[PDB]
Design a binder for these strands. Structure first.
Ligand SMILES: Nc1ccn([C@@H]2O[C@H](COP(=O)(O)OP(=O)(O)OP(=O)(O)O)[C@@H](O)[C@H]2O)c(=O)n1
Ligand SMILES: [Mg+2]
Length: 437
RNA sequence: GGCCCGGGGCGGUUCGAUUCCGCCCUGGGCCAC
């Protein structure tokens, strides 16, 4: 049951079976045919072109090569039109760099425009160095595509796969680059156990040096960090995962963990056992793309957390959840209620000028001296986290993310108790509190 | 959109703010494929 045995069973979970390969090829063929009628230059990139896509995740990436001189606007317009006329059913919903998604003979496809250059330098559009990533990988990943699939499947099952902002994990390309560096999934896992937050992995130079932050230099452009969007905590989760896997290998590390339900009744008893203040800020989900939403939910969530900590409610952790129509910012504090009074540090008895200005203030209790300096009893405007959040969110909505803020401005409410466990956030609450089972 | 570095105007809070909470101008990088 040692590693190598597990890796064999694992291959079954990550390698596409002959039937799925068929579908992808036929779609590839058809897709080329359609493209070969309109003329137009194109290059298949990504995991389908390199035969490193994960089982049950077949998505063909076609990149339309345009002349450098063309305007950004021409790019989207032509790409849009070409995308639409080439797909059975389509859908446009770019985030910054436009592109068209669709289905050809049942397979997902991504038609993306990009400028055609020589030398991946002075990139015109944000995705220009992608075709060069394909060239560089072409002759070096050949024969290790299965090692790539194991790594992707590992990260996928543990929730740190993608590099979109929702995940802030490992991109596919990053994965491929790691296979070319260490040679296999097993070696990557073995070495990643010793990675640090200053680790720099440079495949073009076959080197590993210590830097200012986790960096995986792009062979194509040594100034771009391929793991730029990999968050620190997620880097940390992978390293820990690699350690655990080596100690007690298991096919489980490649199988997705089910949301694993819990009765909102068990959740209520846990919160009571904990004795904390658990609540959420609910508002309507802005109609924007994931890559726009999450960073905003992240800011909002953080801005409120910081409010809760400087206000002494002792926040434990924060979380957030986006559903079809609403969003939720979750919080947990050790302080369900604080006194109305508190002490505010004053000047040292020494300089009377400021002592006066300090005592000149209208106060309900009369300041005192303690260890050489004046202190005053002040009165809070709120005494619970919810009251505090309600206030802050009503007045500081503009700093809670462009769209998330404007939405909280037109409406939001604070949910807690039984009425909160009925919302679709139980998974996030359990993960946030470390509930196990 | 978010994050990092920088210039310049303000508001609030404070005994006391460049130094905490925010707002308006604006320059330069990075990420998302
Ligand atoms: N953060 C990212 C995302 C994408 N890419 C470029 O876009 C390709 C990845 O496109 P994507 O479709 O997001 O993933 P795949 O690489 O195709 O792999 P998989 O579909 O299995 O996730 C990479 O090879 C690379 O050229 C990149 O450089 N950095
Ligand atoms: Mg793909």
């Amino acid at each position: 049951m040692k590693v190598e045995e597990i890796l064999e069973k694992a291959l079954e979970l990550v390698i596409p079976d002959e039937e799925e390969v068929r579908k992808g090829r036929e779609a590839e063929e058809e897709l080329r045919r359609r493209l070969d009628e309109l003329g137009v230059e194109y290059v298949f990139v990504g995991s389908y072109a390199r035969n490193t896509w994960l089982k049950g995740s077949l998505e063909i990436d076609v990149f339309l090569l345009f002349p450098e001189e063309f305007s950004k606007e021409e790019l989207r317009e032509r790409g849009l039109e070409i995308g639409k006329a080439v797909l059975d059913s389509y859908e446009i919903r770019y985030a910054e760099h436009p592109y068209v998604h669709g289905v050809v003979k049942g397979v997902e496809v991504d038609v993306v425009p990009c400028y055609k250059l020589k030398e991946p330098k002075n990139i015109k559009s944000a995705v220009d160095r992608t075709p060069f990533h394909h060239k560089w990988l072409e002759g070096r990943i050949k024969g290790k595509e299965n090692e790539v699939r194991l790594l992707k499947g590992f990260l996928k099952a543990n929730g740190i796969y993608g590099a979109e902002y929702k995940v802030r994990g490992f991109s596919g390309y990053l994965c491929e680059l790691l296979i070319v560096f260490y040679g296999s999934f097993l070696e990557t896992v073995k070495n990643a156990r010793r990675w640090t937050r200053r680790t720099v992995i440079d495949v073009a130079k076959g080197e590993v040096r210590k830097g200012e932050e986790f960096f995986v230099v792009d062979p194509v452009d040594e100034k771009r960090n391929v793991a730029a969007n990999l968050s620190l905590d997620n880097l940390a989760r992978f390293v820990h995962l690699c350690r655990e896997f080596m100690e007690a290998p298991s096919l489980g590390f490649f199988k997705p963990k089910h949301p694993l339900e819990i009765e909102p009744e068990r959740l209520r008893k846990i919160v009571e056992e904990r004795g904390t203040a658990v609540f959420a800020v609910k508002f309507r989900k802005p109609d924007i793309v994931d890559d726009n939403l999450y960073p905003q939910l992240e800011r909002a969530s953080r801005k409120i957390f910081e409010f809760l900590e400087r206000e002494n409610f002792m926040p434990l952790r924060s979380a957030f959840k986006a559903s079809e129509e609403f969003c939720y910012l979750l919080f947990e504090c050790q302080i369900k209620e604080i006194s109305r009074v508190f002490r505010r540090m004053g000047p040292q008895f020494e300089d009377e000028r400021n002592v006066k200005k300090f005592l000149s203030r209208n106060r309900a209790f009369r300041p005192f001296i303690e260890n050489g300096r004046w202190w005053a009893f002040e009165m809070r405007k709120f005494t619970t986290p919810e009251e505090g959040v309600r206030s802050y969110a009503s007045t500081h909505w503009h700093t809670l993310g462009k769209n998330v803020g404007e939405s909280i401005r037109e409406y939001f409410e604070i949910i807690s108790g039984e009425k909160l466990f009925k919302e679709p956030v139980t998974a996030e609450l359990c993960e946030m509190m470390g509930v196990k089972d």
